[PDB]
């Protein structure tokens, strides 16, 4: 999908596609944030010093 592919919505239902995309994006963002929290350097709440080695 690009800017010029407007005809993709004659194949994909815009409402269901939007809902599925929102769910996927939220889940991915949560996963990435949790991965950052799962490591010492990038857990901004834990606040370890940047040099973890």
């Amino acid at each position: 999908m690009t800017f010029s592919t407007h005809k993709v919505w004659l194949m994909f239902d815009p409402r269901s596609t939007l809902v599925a995309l929102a769910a996927f994006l939220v889940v991915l963002a949560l996963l990435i944030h949790f991965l950052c929290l799962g490591h010492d350097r990038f857990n901004w709440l834990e606040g370890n010093p940047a040099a973890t080695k």
Binding site: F3, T5, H6, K7, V8, W9, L10, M11, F12, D13, P14, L18, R41, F42, W44, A50, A51, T52, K53
Partner: protein, 49 residues
């Protein structure tokens, strides 16, 4: 077609969708620049030292 929309309707929906997607990607790019400025996330050969 298989969704019931017309090509004219598909054009305006895709315009709004493309603008929203570009805005989301721009915000994410700015956030990644900020995160890098906070703590860069590609380590060198010696790790995080």
């Amino acid at each position: 077609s298989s969704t019931g929309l017309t090509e004219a309707e598909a054009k305006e929906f895709h315009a709004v969708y493309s603008q929203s997607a570009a805005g989301f990607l721009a915000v994410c790019a700015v956030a990644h620049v900020l995160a890098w400025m906070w703590r860069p996330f590609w380590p060198g050969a010696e790790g995080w030292v």
